[PDB]
Amino acid sequence: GKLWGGRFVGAVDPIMEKFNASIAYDRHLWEVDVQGSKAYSRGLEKAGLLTKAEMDQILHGLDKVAEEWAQGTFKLNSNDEDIHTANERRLKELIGATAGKLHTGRSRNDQVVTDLRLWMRQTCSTLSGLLWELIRTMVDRAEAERDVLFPGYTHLQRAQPIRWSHWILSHAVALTRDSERLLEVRKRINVLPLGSGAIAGNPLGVDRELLRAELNFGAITLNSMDATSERDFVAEFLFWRSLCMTHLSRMAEDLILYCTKEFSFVQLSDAYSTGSSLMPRKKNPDSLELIRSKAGRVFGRCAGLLMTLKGLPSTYNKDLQEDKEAVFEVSDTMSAVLQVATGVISTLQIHQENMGQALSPDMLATDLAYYLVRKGMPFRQAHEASGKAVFMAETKGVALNQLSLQELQTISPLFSGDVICVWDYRHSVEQYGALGGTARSSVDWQIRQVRALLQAQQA
Amino acid sequence: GAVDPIMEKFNASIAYDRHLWEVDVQGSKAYSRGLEKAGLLTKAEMDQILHGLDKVAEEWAQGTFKLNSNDEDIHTANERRLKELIGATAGKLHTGRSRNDQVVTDLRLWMRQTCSTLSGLLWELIRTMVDRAEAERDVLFPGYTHLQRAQPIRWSHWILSHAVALTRDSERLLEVRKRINVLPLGSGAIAGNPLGVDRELLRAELNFGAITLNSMDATSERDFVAEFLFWRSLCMTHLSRMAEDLILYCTKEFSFVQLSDAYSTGSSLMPRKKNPDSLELIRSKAGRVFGRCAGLLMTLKGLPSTYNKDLQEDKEAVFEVSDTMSAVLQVATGVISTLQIHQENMGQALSPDMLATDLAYYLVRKGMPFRQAHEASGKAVFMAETKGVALNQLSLQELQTISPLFSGDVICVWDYRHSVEQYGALGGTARSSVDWQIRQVRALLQAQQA
Amino acid sequence: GAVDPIMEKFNASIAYDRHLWEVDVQGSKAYSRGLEKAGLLTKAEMDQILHGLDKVAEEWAQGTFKLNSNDEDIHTANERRLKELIGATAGKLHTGRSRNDQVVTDLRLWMRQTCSTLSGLLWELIRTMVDRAEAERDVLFPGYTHLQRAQPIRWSHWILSHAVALTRDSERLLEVRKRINVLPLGSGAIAGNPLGVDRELLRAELNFGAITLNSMDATSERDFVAEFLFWRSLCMTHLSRMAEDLILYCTKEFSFVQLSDAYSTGSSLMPRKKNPDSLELIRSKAGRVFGRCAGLLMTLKGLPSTYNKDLQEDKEAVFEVSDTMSAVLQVATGVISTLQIHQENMGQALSPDMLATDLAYYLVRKGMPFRQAHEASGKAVFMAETKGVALNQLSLQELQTISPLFSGDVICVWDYRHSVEQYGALGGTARSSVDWQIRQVRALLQAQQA
Amino acid sequence: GKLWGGRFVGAVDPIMEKFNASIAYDRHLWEVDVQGSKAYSRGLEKAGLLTKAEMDQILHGLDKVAEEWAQGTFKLNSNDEDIHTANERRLKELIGATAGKLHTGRSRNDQVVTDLRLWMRQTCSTLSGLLWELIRTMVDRAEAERDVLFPGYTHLQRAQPIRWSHWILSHAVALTRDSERLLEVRKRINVLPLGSGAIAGNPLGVDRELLRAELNFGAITLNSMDATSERDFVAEFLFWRSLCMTHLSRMAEDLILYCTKEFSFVQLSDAYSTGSSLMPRKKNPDSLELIRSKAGRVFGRCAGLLMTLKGLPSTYNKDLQEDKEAVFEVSDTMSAVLQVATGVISTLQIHQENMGQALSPDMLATDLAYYLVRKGMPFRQAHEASGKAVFMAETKGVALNQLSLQELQTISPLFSGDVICVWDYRHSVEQYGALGGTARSSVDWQIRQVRALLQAQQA
């Protein structure tokens, strides 16, 4: 430089340095990094790169390092870049000699990825459990409240009565798909990348099958270049989370709407709401709004990882370092949101009366038509008839359920005495007996169906 | 006042959903077939419907079908032409059915076809790549990290790295296809079918893997659209890397490959400047595909139960993304099968300084710990430096100055073919590992087609 | 082999860029005009070009123009028809010009027109809203936080909240329009114009605010496309909130407004169920617009210098997003000018418990610190609770039980009209503040049109 | 609950609580929160809500609180939710009485936003400076190295010689637009939202103009509902950053490419690169790759904020809380990347020779044609002629610049003796004299033009 201005800090530049450190967050990989180093150690042994004594020397030291981590006893170094350097710097202050043999044939490229996949395999496990717990909860409450009725909506307009349980099962069913997707992602995560070296593979011929068995992975990567540069397992996870958050954001929207004075169908426990000091009736759905806001947080990370991966040349690049924080943040968010959601549906109260009061006779206008279709009349005919029925009561200035059986017969001779069954909102939902419908029997069918899916997924 | 021209045009969908004509009739025919089993139609009335419905398909096939100015969507157009074709018996078709569960059935049916075609194209591209790898596994060129020459590797190992990524894309497509294959029909407008139609019958007629569990979910969820769009996005990511790599290799600077005249554009006054048009188009679609995916998730976010007009935004995204993938896969397949590698320039890019590390492995392989071996290599590096000659030009005696272990073997290290063969552990670039890889993807691929 | 049908179709752009026909001729005419000032054409040759170029526009106007099967893009079609129209003199037009700087000039010219039209539509929508606010400033309904009834406010204050947000959108559009108005022509393929054509002349002829500073940037940057797409995205965000609000208010539950039959769909058997079709469409476009924006940024990311085929992805995004905004603004304008508020239901939603806070302000206003006043209000709340009567039904004597300050005034607190008038500080919901707001946006709006 | 399983933690739930805290990050708003409280204090005074003594009582206490923050002396409370509660909890332990009068008529809704805008106004200021510094640096080096030549590319294929300075100015020019956009965003940020209350406005009629003058804002918000719920200023900023990162990612791609053995035009200082232990020639562009990876990080936050804002109902909602961390993270990233970029272009070395060697005669084939066009020949004619010229040398098996003047005349009689000027790459770039072209004079024009823009922006 010097012929012009600029930034001449020297031969280091602290900005470039902290902006390069990852220990601030990858530090959580200490558990799996150690674990992953013990397995490589046993690998080198069989390969004949160290002795049964050197292995136990190293192996043992590693356990001492882990212990320090589990006690908060581990003294980190500003002289430390990442959790990888930290662990083998300590493993060197406890063994010195052999310690500098563990990384033989190993690169940070295939080492770090092994740590991330190992760590995720574990985190995705708990996520699977937290999710099955939310589904099981929703399903159980659905069975308990199978006889409550409230309105179903389209364009957010009251359409017709439905079972509150049906509404619950509608979100549960979507979540089981999220549950199914997580399981598929978990398989592709359970693949051992260790032994790929920096790009061309392991040069000293260590056993890949052994390493695979040690760490208990499901398989080994087919290609070293892919294994060290691909991040499909991270992108896939982020999308899974994003689509799951979509569903939760929808359940949040519904519930938030249902607890407005305007609807008053549901009410949240004080544990998940915030009231007004001078207004006892004002109960803000903080919890629900929080959940809804997290859908963007999550989707954005996914969008961000995709733009980072786009157009990168083979093989390994520093750009790949952006994966860790993304996974961490989304992992925490998903755990919190899932548990908070389980607590909400678990402790929310419903107002059966308000729910029943939102049902009105004008919703039955169409049931009147179905009554005629079972009598043999074509739909167009019945629809037109029920139309006349609607028009009648209107002029008479009364409700559709106040038309006399005689008045109805001036519409069609098919209207018999049983027509009073149409005026029952209960009778209305029972029409949908076809599998997947809102009829009580169908809801039982759904509950069994979901119970089984959960079971098949436990395997 | 009573009607706004923009509002109508805005609300119109016939423009694009007209592509659903064929799957639409299939859905209707099957519905009517299950409609009479419920007693809503007479064996005679069904025949009318079925027969007349075929008449409708026929016109679409010949391109004689006359869209009406009053036609809102494909669902309406087919039912209008069915009416004026067989009378009012046609107005019995829709009984107990809603557009909510009818539209989604068509979309799924349409997607089930297209995705089968995509799986096909994708498998062919992967197949084309593995085949090429098998044939050129002798070729050697440089491997890169931070776009900085690292070490020699097999050109087949490079092809395989990408082939394997696409193989995962193939697997994800199959999982998505399983979830697409679920019947929503008989779910009504929101609460289900009120006239007791048999859904297992509909499922059997339309060949679906299963039926939907919940009516509210079946007519409002668009997971199968989102998944599909994401699948395409991640797959494009893979093609963009491959395209980036090839564009780089086509430069005068790298000069490793040359595209055929079919996927490249030349210069009139410069017969040596060929533009990777094809490759650049492939890379530009990554964003286009992702944008739809992004746009669709933002649309689904925060919608309340159950059905809302916002869902009408699925079709165009599916159509656009499907067309894009179809073309991009074929083009990619075309460039891969006809490109031409320049072997001499690839080997010419290999240098002896890339072999410094090998000298280290050489030492550890016969004794000393890695640490010592590395430091021993640094001396061999510095030595040849001060003497102005590549490591390759360093005499056995001189190396022995660093360590006694530098036996006669050391000469083999100077051979790139030896360097690559060091990686036999499964997944490495050694020829035997490549054979293994070729057999694995080949097997893996066979499993996905069963 | 030598030609792949997919590759061509894939590379084709005439399908959509045909919309650039008119701006294309303008660009060419102006170029030729500056081409002869440089001595490359004879005053006679220019006339040929100019005259013949008009002939080309003419055909496009009448729709008599015959696209050729060999036509790649609009730029080619217009030059092919110019040739076969006035001879080889036409082949002198492109001298020193490149598609790189020609295409970008057309896009900018096209956008400069469209954005002027959008600014117009947007201003009308804002205008329509302010006018309505002025007319209905007496109306009072509830304000919400966490969708939980908070306090009474003016319905005009609600309209103004949105109007003001759109006003910022209007301002951003104007800044974007300034950057769109820059001439790229005379920038060549990459290094600039080699034949010394005068760029200030071209700029003057085409009415551009300025010329580009650097040829490499002028033919590769697409900032003006990105900015525009983001502008639309943030504007859609605003319309989606407004749409969400109105859809909510249209529900039976809130029943505050009713859309006219032009922007809503009804039910045959339920004459009281009107669907907010229009509103739902507007909200669904937020994602569509954003997707393009997202997709385009991902396309620009990581491209090396200078021009690459990836840039061909700008046009469709611009066209699609422009059409969407045009319709969405008009529709929104239509619903706002014809919707109908239900005043009784709006006031009916107001409750006395919303006035609890006012009693507190009442106390601080005449003495005691806020803390004491609040606690004093809590007692008035609890009191009326245990007695089973709203705060409104609490007698002066009883309130005095809490504090002596509860003079006769207290009765005014029970009037919602008094509650709202408490907010006179500029920007509040008091009527005088609303008048102020109406005058500010009106003034602000006038400044943007000068 | 209880009739089914679920999460019954009680009346609190620690998950919902930490997932609700913001002090972990909003703590940085302590500077501006205090500042913003001093101004509201003076507001209440004039409005007559407190005495000249109560104001000084409160006002003074606030300064003591600030001081504790600046010393690290401030003792935070797990009993603290956000930086807002923290500051007035301390302001209460130092004044007790009056302390509970500062928040009169003020809501956390208009308070928090004032803090964010106040904080950003300040952060965007330094960002403007860091950016002008990068531009000034690039511009200065462009002037110093105006006589270096290397190839210009299209489709990443060598096209024709250009000035290295022109390439530099191409990115500088784009960045000045980023600079212009930041300035526009800064205006819309400098608007005072304080005095909007929670939704309806300030109830006690405090002076909005006063507050505006105290905090030195540029204007006051027109509407309380908008002022407390809109976040355009945050979204706008995030996009600005995203589009700026697009440009930097492009400069990174170029430079990364230019420092490959294949190109070898540029080399980075050790301060911003990482070499290989056993390979001294291998210099990895870590710094550049880092910059490139950050474009996705940033864009993703923007995408995330937009999805969060979409469809939210009026007025204030908890979802709006997602704004703080987004701004913070992107703000730090932009500061680091801009400085790192200034250090890179400031200290990178070029290899004039390698750059000159990448230029080849076949690039001049077209210049040969321009030579004839100035001679009067139409372009088609000249292009065809230069085509024949190209074909000739090819058959003769020699370079285009080795054709004799006589050989050239067998092509066209117009080829004179000065044609040897075409064979000079220097002569080639000098053809582009039209403003914006790569000719030396044009580059001077550009440098003056940018110098002036920077100046007009300093105002």
Coordinates of N, CA, C and O in Angstrom, one line a residue, chain A residues 50-51 53-55 57-58 91 95-103:
Chain A
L50 N 0.2 -46.5 16.0 CA 0.5 -46.3 17.4 C 0.3 -47.6 18.1 O -0.3 -48.5 17.6
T51 N 0.9 -47.7 19.3 CA 0.9 -48.9 20.1 C -0.3 -49.0 21.1 O -0.9 -48.0 21.5
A53 N -0.3 -49.1 23.9 CA 0.1 -48.3 25.1 C -0.1 -46.8 24.7 O -0.6 -46.0 25.5
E54 N 0.2 -46.5 23.5 CA 0.1 -45.1 23.0 C -1.4 -44.8 22.9 O -1.9 -43.7 23.2
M55 N -2.2 -45.8 22.4 CA -3.6 -45.6 22.3 C -4.3 -45.4 23.7 O -5.0 -44.4 23.8
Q57 N -2.7 -44.4 26.2 CA -2.1 -43.1 26.7 C -3.0 -42.0 26.2 O -3.6 -41.3 27.1
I58 N -3.2 -41.9 24.9 CA -4.1 -40.9 24.3 C -5.5 -41.0 24.8 O -6.1 -40.1 25.2
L91 N -4.9 -31.9 25.7 CA -4.5 -33.3 25.5 C -3.0 -33.4 25.4 O -2.4 -34.5 25.5
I95 N -0.2 -35.2 28.2 CA 0.5 -36.3 27.6 C 1.7 -35.9 26.8 O 2.7 -36.7 26.6
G96 N 1.7 -34.6 26.3 CA 2.8 -34.1 25.6 C 3.3 -34.8 24.4 O 3.2 -34.4 23.2
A97 N 3.9 -36.0 24.6 CA 4.5 -36.8 23.5 C 3.5 -37.3 22.5 O 3.3 -36.6 21.5
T98 N 3.0 -38.5 22.8 CA 2.0 -39.1 21.9 C 0.9 -38.2 21.4 O 0.4 -38.3 20.2
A99 N 0.5 -37.3 22.2 CA -0.6 -36.3 21.9 C -0.5 -35.8 20.5 O -1.5 -35.6 19.8
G100 N 0.7 -35.6 20.0 CA 0.9 -35.1 18.6 C 0.9 -36.1 17.6 O 1.6 -36.0 16.5
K101 N 0.2 -37.2 17.8 CA 0.1 -38.3 16.8 C -1.4 -38.6 16.5 O -1.6 -39.3 15.5
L102 N -2.3 -38.1 17.3 CA -3.7 -38.3 17.1 C -4.2 -37.8 15.8 O -5.1 -38.4 15.2
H103 N -3.7 -36.7 15.4 CA -4.2 -36.0 14.1 C -3.5 -36.5 12.9 O -3.5 -35.9 11.8

